[PDB]
Write a protein that holds these residues in place. Structure first.
Motif, mmCIF file in Angstrom:
data_model
loop_
_atom_site.group_PDB
_atom_site.id
_atom_site.type_symbol
_atom_site.label_atom_id
_atom_site.label_comp_id
_atom_site.label_asym_id
_atom_site.label_seq_id
_atom_site.Cartn_x
_atom_site.Cartn_y
_atom_site.Cartn_z
ATOM 1 N N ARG D 7 -28.853 -34.871 5.441
ATOM 2 C CA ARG D 7 -27.784 -34.959 4.438
ATOM 3 C C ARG D 7 -26.715 -33.880 4.630
ATOM 4 N N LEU D 8 -27.148 -32.643 4.874
ATOM 5 C CA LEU D 8 -26.240 -31.488 4.937
ATOM 6 C C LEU D 8 -25.701 -31.218 6.347
ATOM 7 N N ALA D 9 -25.889 -32.164 7.271
ATOM 8 C CA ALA D 9 -25.834 -31.890 8.710
ATOM 9 C C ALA D 9 -24.532 -32.402 9.332
ATOM 10 N N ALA D 10 -23.443 -32.332 8.569
ATOM 11 C CA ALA D 10 -22.172 -32.929 8.964
ATOM 12 C C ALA D 10 -21.336 -31.976 9.821
ATOM 13 N N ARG D 11 -21.598 -30.671 9.716
ATOM 14 C CA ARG D 11 -21.001 -29.692 10.628
ATOM 15 C C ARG D 11 -21.509 -29.851 12.058
ATOM 16 N N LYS D 12 -22.803 -30.129 12.213
ATOM 17 C CA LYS D 12 -23.401 -30.365 13.534
ATOM 18 C C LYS D 12 -22.828 -31.614 14.207
ATOM 19 N N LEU D 13 -22.676 -32.690 13.438
ATOM 20 C CA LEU D 13 -22.143 -33.955 13.953
ATOM 21 C C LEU D 13 -20.651 -33.902 14.289
ATOM 22 N N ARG D 14 -19.856 -33.276 13.422
ATOM 23 C CA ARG D 14 -18.407 -33.159 13.644
ATOM 24 C C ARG D 14 -18.075 -32.243 14.823
ATOM 25 N N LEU D 15 -18.800 -31.133 14.940
ATOM 26 C CA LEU D 15 -18.532 -30.132 15.977
ATOM 27 C C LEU D 15 -19.058 -30.554 17.351
ATOM 28 N N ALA D 16 -20.216 -31.215 17.374
ATOM 29 C CA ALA D 16 -20.748 -31.829 18.603
ATOM 30 C C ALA D 16 -19.880 -32.975 19.140
ATOM 31 N N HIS D 17 -19.219 -33.707 18.242
ATOM 32 C CA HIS D 17 -18.285 -34.767 18.630
ATOM 33 C C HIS D 17 -17.053 -34.228 19.361
ATOM 34 N N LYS D 18 -16.520 -33.098 18.899
ATOM 35 C CA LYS D 18 -15.367 -32.461 19.552
ATOM 36 C C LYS D 18 -15.648 -32.037 20.999
ATOM 37 N N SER D 19 -16.873 -31.583 21.268
ATOM 38 C CA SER D 19 -17.304 -31.247 22.631
ATOM 39 C C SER D 19 -17.325 -32.462 23.554
ATOM 40 N N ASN D 20 -17.937 -33.549 23.087
ATOM 41 C CA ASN D 20 -18.173 -34.735 23.921
ATOM 42 C C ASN D 20 -16.907 -35.526 24.277
ATOM 43 N N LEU D 21 -15.821 -35.313 23.532
ATOM 44 C CA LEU D 21 -14.509 -35.855 23.898
ATOM 45 C C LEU D 21 -13.954 -35.288 25.207
ATOM 46 N N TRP D 22 -14.262 -34.027 25.502
ATOM 47 C CA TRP D 22 -13.824 -33.395 26.754
ATOM 48 C C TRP D 22 -14.503 -33.939 28.020
ATOM 49 N N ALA D 23 -15.604 -34.672 27.864
ATOM 50 C CA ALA D 23 -16.142 -35.493 28.954
ATOM 51 C C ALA D 23 -15.277 -36.718 29.255
ATOM 52 N N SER D 24 -14.752 -37.354 28.206
ATOM 53 C CA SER D 24 -13.898 -38.539 28.346
ATOM 54 C C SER D 24 -12.589 -38.185 29.040
ATOM 55 N N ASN D 25 -12.260 -38.928 30.093
ATOM 56 C CA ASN D 25 -11.173 -38.552 30.995
ATOM 57 C C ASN D 25 -9.788 -38.833 30.394
ATOM 58 N N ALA D 26 -9.710 -39.809 29.487
ATOM 59 C CA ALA D 26 -8.451 -40.181 28.830
ATOM 60 C C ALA D 26 -7.983 -39.140 27.802
ATOM 61 N N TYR D 27 -8.916 -38.661 26.978
ATOM 62 C CA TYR D 27 -8.690 -37.506 26.089
ATOM 63 C C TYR D 27 -8.350 -36.229 26.865
ATOM 64 N N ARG D 28 -9.009 -36.059 28.008
ATOM 65 C CA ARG D 28 -8.817 -34.906 28.890
ATOM 66 C C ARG D 28 -7.427 -34.898 29.535
ATOM 67 N N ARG D 29 -6.966 -36.074 29.969
ATOM 68 C CA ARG D 29 -5.658 -36.227 30.620
ATOM 69 C C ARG D 29 -4.486 -36.082 29.643
ATOM 70 N N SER D 30 -4.636 -36.643 28.442
ATOM 71 C CA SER D 30 -3.627 -36.530 27.378
ATOM 72 C C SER D 30 -3.421 -35.086 26.921
ATOM 73 N N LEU D 31 -4.533 -34.468 26.537
ATOM 74 C CA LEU D 31 -4.601 -33.101 26.031
ATOM 75 C C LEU D 31 -4.222 -31.973 26.993
ATOM 76 N N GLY D 32 -4.639 -32.072 28.252
ATOM 77 C CA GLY D 32 -4.341 -31.017 29.206
ATOM 78 C C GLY D 32 -2.854 -30.825 29.421
ATOM 79 N N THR D 33 -2.126 -31.924 29.571
ATOM 80 C CA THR D 33 -0.683 -31.834 29.735
ATOM 81 C C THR D 33 -0.118 -30.783 30.720
ATOM 82 N N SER D 34 -0.385 -30.814 32.030
ATOM 83 C CA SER D 34 -1.208 -31.735 32.833
ATOM 84 C C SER D 34 -0.502 -33.028 33.241
ATOM 85 N N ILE D 35 0.649 -33.292 32.635
ATOM 86 C CA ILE D 35 1.441 -34.468 32.970
ATOM 87 C C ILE D 35 2.847 -34.019 33.321
ATOM 88 N N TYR D 36 3.207 -32.857 32.793
ATOM 89 C CA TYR D 36 4.513 -32.254 32.995
ATOM 90 C C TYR D 36 4.760 -31.904 34.453
#
Lengths: 40, 166, 162, 140, 246
Positions: D7-36
């Motif tokens: 029930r109280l474990a929403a900090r673990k889920l939200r913060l672990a989700h932010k890490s796993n996005l950096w594996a995804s290459n599309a989020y990685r390419r957009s964010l790095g910028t990296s395009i300039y």
RNA sequence: ACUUGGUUGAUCCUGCCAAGGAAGCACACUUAGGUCAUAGAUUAAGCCAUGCAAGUGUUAGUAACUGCGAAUAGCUCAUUAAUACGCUCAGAAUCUAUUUGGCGGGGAUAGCAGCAGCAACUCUGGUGCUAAUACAUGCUGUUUCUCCAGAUGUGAAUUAUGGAGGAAAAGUUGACCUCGAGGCACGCCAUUCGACUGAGUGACCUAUCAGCUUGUACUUAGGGUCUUUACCUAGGUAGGCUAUCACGGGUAACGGGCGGUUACCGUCGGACUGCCGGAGAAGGCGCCUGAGAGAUAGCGACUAUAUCCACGGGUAGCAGCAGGCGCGAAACUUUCCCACUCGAGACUUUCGGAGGAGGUAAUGACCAGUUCCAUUGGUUACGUGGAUAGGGGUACGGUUUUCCACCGUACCGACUAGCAGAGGGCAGUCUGGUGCCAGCAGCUGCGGUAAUUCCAGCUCUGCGAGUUUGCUCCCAUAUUGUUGCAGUUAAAACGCCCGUAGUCUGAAUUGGCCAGCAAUGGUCGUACGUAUACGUUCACUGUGAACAAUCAGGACGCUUAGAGUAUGGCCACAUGAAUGACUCAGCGCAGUAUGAAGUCUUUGUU
């Protein structure tokens, strides 16, 4: 629309002017006018 | 100008805080009156909402007040002996609030015989009255008010401040 | 402000869907394939509204007001008979039902035009009216009440001018 | 199982989700910028002056020389190869003209047989190649 | 930084007034006055979009300046003057008397009334305080400072007010068993008999009852104590704050 | 609520890559008509010629002065990572022009008249007069300090107010217009539009940012402020924030209402968003006037661009409306107008590039035509037979401030379609030219002289006034997984054990029995405190308060539709402009199943 009134006393004073010229009764100020500030 | 604003200063957490705007005339400070003694003069000051804070620069007299007897006479202020904030206020004889300054009390002495000849009086005050310079505190705000007045120093207070002078 | 009345189909080159949509156009005498897709999208807002009403309780304040109001508007349009006037039968209905209520087709049933295509021509050339009021627009949707009142506008049919 | 469900474990889920996005290459390419740091600069279409004409050839198995012009860009002052579509068309382009370049349409990467270049010439001299190739507009 | 601003837009104009979204951008900003911006209704709008005499806004500013209209005894040549809840509107020439007052739903309506009734008006006590020589005095939902007011005049009491002379004739006390029209929030424009008064620690609630027999609460500041026990001291509208329900 | 082509000789998988659907910028080809909306944000918050945008006269202050306005509206998003914005509270710690209601009580200049000076300007000098609801004069309160009391009012103030004292001018003294009525002052309290101070709280990445903070954190006294506060200056302590992410860094970050995509959950975008709030006027910085400004079509200086010079000196801030230069893939007329909506004012009259209307644009949304009905011959679509339009033209009536275009009425009448493809994903094994060359091709692949993919013709297909092509972006994707993935071998379980933060934490406490359809109501149990209400609070559930447009949704034939708030009754009437969601937090009463806290015992509570 339309409306009817007693006497001639209404449309002389209550009506807008654009209906009076139509029925039967220019930036000069902006330019020429502001010369009265430019000249004293 | 001199600002009363606090946004620039650091948070409780100790963070470098940043401006988002100019200085503003809500939060305008002004210079100190620095209200000394000798020759009366006043400078009027416009403020928020029209109005006048009559700022007093140098004051000779003050409307002082014997509390216990109910009597209050316009009396000439001579000097600052003491001030609890600053010793710099003592050196230049600045009238602030809470400012311990002696007074001639010629009017008070006159009041005692014109009334009486009730009265009774305290044994600390008669040791003061032979000199003719009572201790007293400024209770007004000289700068904002433009007028300075205070009650006589008496009772348990009169023991306390007398040690701080001596 | 604005809204998107028709929606495009999901997959362009399906054989069954294209072969279906020609013989709705052919029967009801129609311009494009988009003039179906609006009537599909009109059928969606009826049924999406209906289904949500169905999920609610059988007594709820929302269902009583909306359910009576929804069926009232479709008995006007003349899709639901009084036999079928019971809310689940809204989740039925086809584009073939809702196409039939349009003015083009109601002229044809009337037979004044004499053809589905002819009916379109009569309305597009200002010949047909609905209670002394001219209707240029070939998709009116007639409300059964007024279906009887479909008649010649005046011009060539009545005036007889060349 | 394999994650915090409590029930109280929403900090673990939200913060672990932010890490796993950096594996995804599309989020990685957009964010790095990296395009300039790109010749396009993230712009679909770019224009500028032609330097010259070059023959670059296909990989394998496709034996063919492709004819891609070298073009200096306006805004960066960089240089980049760019394919010229339709037969003829290299003859229509002329030396030292302005041209409008756009992407290969592959959202980056290198497309067909043709390696290296990621760019095709849409217009020349404010006209368009299709009109030119078809010959319903003219060049002086 | 924001100052006091002139140009009211439509959209931002309140949902009382029944304004078109079209017919221009700007609405008529009320002048400063007795009543607030949100609760009130000007007399520019009153003659355009209720009685429908002045078709254009040029024609509406004509007839106020001829001095036919009278807000509440006085003439008022200013126009766009905020007029809201229990104000009498005497009108010259083809004279008619109105009282401004809420609908069922929260909207404003306009009501032809008898002249003997339309002398007086009601006035709720918002604020009670002492000032000048131990004298109690009262501000109203207008802002009429009624000094030398009698005892038994506390907060949330109505006062009947004679208009020709500056008098306070009656005083309808706040209590249980007393009729009250709600004048703000969701339950705005609703009659109710007051069954319960719930004191609220610090910053209180009041439970009400239609003649139909619905039930609803509100904050205490919203209720306007209209008259003592069923029969009010006022001509009420059609339906009488009951509100339809199917 | 959807799949299909691509690793193999073939298979089943994991797995992405493509295809596929939507919008939003830009390029392209093509184009009967109508209504409506928007259009130099992305890069250069870069630079600007010329014209114009804020002025203001009533029968009632006397070209000026005087009074008010110019701090709003408009434009833009460069700062800003929460101090701003939002949403709850709060002023008992405050200020407020104007309205509104109470309570009150003679002399000196401006135009006008005259003499001069500059290359120049909406700069002026100097003398000669005269105005007042301008300025000064003048027949108990305000401000502040001391003391004694401290309300019929509040959750709460030694508050409001009253009395007894002293001071001070910072002052209420209708020295007033138009013909018995209207209007205008002055002061104090409230009120209104607000403003301004404080609190709680919500949200973009980053650990290759783990320690940060010296007025920094508390306290006592002062100064200053509209007030409260390190806002600032003193004396005295040495504190505050941090793994529940401090501090630092980044942003191709103005925040919000909301917009696009969707079966639900979500997710991306939010300059604009037809509104709200903030900030800024080339860059800082400072200040006067005022109720309100740290104003910028106000002033001052410096700096950087630009320009004039008679070489002495100055002049100007388009991120207002047009227009140009530059920038680039990328964005309109130097028009007409105060009538509509409203705003300023001494005001029914003046003025408004706010606003309204045309004009240009395939940018966007809805609507919609390119014909129809007969029957002769060739296999029911490939000289006839007649009909009916609007595109268009010309009048006149409506329409609007004026055109245009629309809506009518009558008369003229036998030029209107492309774009993309035809191996498979997803309609030819036609004929002709080309021969791993030219070229096509998102992906797989085609072309080496027999091309079902090239270059052309013919036929056929799709969608249709639209239709391809770039880049960003969501779905497809349970390939970001709360719902909802996977980890023996495909990528993936720390080498093992301890272990704090963190998340998680067995059973147990007032029920049984009968009428059941539930709400409930009886019986069994009497457990006998307060002395007709009081005897834990929360979370959670129900119910109630509180809190524009858009979204959903009701009513109504705008000719229909997108829309709009209307509109319907021939005798003066009836209406409607609902409701829900927006929504987490904060607030009240009621219910206690689940889950918490409450419960100092080698002896606790009254």
């Amino acid at each position: 629309f339309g409306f009817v009134y007693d006497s001639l006393d209404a449309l002389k004073k209550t009506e807008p002017k654009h209906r009076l010229i139509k029925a039967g009764l220019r930036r000069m100020r902006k330019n020429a006018r502001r010369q009265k500030v430019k000249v004293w | 100008g001199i600002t009363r604003m606090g946004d620039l200063k650091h948070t409780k957490s100790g963070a470098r805080q940043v401006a988002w705007r100019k200085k503003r005339n809500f939060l305008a400070g002004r210079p100190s009156a620095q209200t000394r003694i000798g020759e009366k003069r006043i400078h009027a000051v416009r403020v928020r909402g029209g109005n006048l804070k009559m700022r007093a620069l140098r004051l000779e007299t003050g409307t002082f007040a014997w509390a216990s007897e109910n009597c209050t006479r316009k009396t000439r202020i001579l000097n600052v002996t003491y001030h609890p904030a600053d010793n710099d206020l003592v050196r230049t004889n600045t009238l602030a609030r809470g400012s311990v300054v002696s007074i001639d009390a010629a009017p008070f002495k006159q009041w005692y015989e014109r009334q009486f000849g009730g009265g009774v009086v305290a044994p600390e005050l008669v040791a003061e009255f032979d000199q003719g310079r009572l201790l007293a505190v400024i209770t007004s705000r000289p700068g904002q008010c433009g007028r300075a007045d205070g009650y006589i120093l008496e009772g348990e207070e009169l023991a306390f401040y007398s040690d701080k002078i001596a | 402000n604005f809204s998107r009345t028709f929606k495009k189909p999901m997959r362009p080159y399906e054989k069954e869907r294209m072969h279906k949509e020609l013989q709705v156009v052919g029967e009801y005498g129609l311009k494009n394939k988009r003039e179906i897709w609006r009537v599909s999208y009109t059928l969606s807002k009826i049924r999406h509204a209906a289904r949500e009403l169905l999920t609610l309780p059988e007594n709820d304040s929302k269902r009583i007001f909306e359910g009576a109001a929804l069926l009232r508007r479709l008995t006007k349009l003349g899709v639901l008979d009084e036999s079928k006037q019971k809310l689940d039968y809204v989740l039925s209905l086809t584009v073939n039902d809702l196409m039939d209520r349009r003015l083009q087709t109601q002229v044809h049933k009337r037979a004044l035009a004499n053809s589905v295509h002819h009916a379109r021509t009569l309305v597009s050339h200002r010949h047909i009216s609905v209670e002394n009021q001219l209707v240029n627009q070939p998709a009116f949707l007639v409300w059964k009440e007024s279906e009887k009142n479909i008649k010649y506008a005046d011009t060539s049919v009545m005036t007889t001018e060349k | 199982k394999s994650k915090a469900c409590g029930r109280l474990a929403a900090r673990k889920l939200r913060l672990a989700h932010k890490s796993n996005l950096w594996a995804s290459n599309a989020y990685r390419r957009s964010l790095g910028t990296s395009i300039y740091k790109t010749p396009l600069e993230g712009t679909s279409m770019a224009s500028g002056i032609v330097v010259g004409k070059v023959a670059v050839e296909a990989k394998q198995p496709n034996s063919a020389i492709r004819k891609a012009v070298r073009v200096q860009l306006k805004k960066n002052s960089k240089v980049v190869t760019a394919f010229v579509p339709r037969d003829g068309s290299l003859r229509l382009i002329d030396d030292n003209d302005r041209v409008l370049i756009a992407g290969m349409g592959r959202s980056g990467r290198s497309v067909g047989d043709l390696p290296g270049c990621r760019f095709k010439v849409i217009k020349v001299a404010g006209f368009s190649l299709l009109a030119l190739w078809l010959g319903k507009k003219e060049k002086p | 930084p924001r100052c006091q601003r002139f140009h009211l837009k439509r959209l931002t104009a309140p949902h009382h007034w029944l304004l078109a979204k079209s017919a221009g951008k700007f609405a008529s900003h009320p002048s400063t006055g007795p009543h607030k911006l949100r609760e009130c209704l000007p007399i520019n709008i009153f003659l355009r979009d209720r009685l429908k005499y002045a078709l254009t806004a040029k024609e509406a500013v004509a007839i106020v300046k001829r001095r036919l209209v009278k807000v509440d005894g006085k003439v008022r040549t200013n126009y766009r003057y905020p007029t809201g809840l229990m104000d009498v509107i005497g009108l010259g020439k083809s004279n008619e008397l109105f009282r401004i007052i809420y609908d069922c739903k929260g909207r404003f309506c306009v009501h032809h009334i008898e002249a003997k009734e339309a002398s007086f008006k009601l006035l709720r006590v918002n604020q009670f305080k002492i000032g000048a020589k131990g004298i109690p005095h009262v501000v109203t939902h207008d802002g009429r400072t009624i000094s030398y007011v009698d005892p038994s005049v506390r907060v949330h009491d109505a006062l009947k007010f004679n208009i020709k002379t500056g008098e306070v004739e009656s005083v309808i006390k706040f209590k249980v068993g007393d009729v009250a029209m709600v004048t703000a929030g969701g339950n705005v424009g609703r009659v109710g008999t007051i069954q319960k008064i719930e004191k609220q620690m610090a910053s209180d609630i009041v439970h009400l009852k239609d003649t139909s027999g619905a039930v609803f609460a509100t904050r205490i500041m919203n209720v306007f104590v209209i008259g003592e026990n069923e029969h009010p001291l006022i001509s009420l509208p059609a339906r009488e704050g009951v509100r339809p329900s199917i």
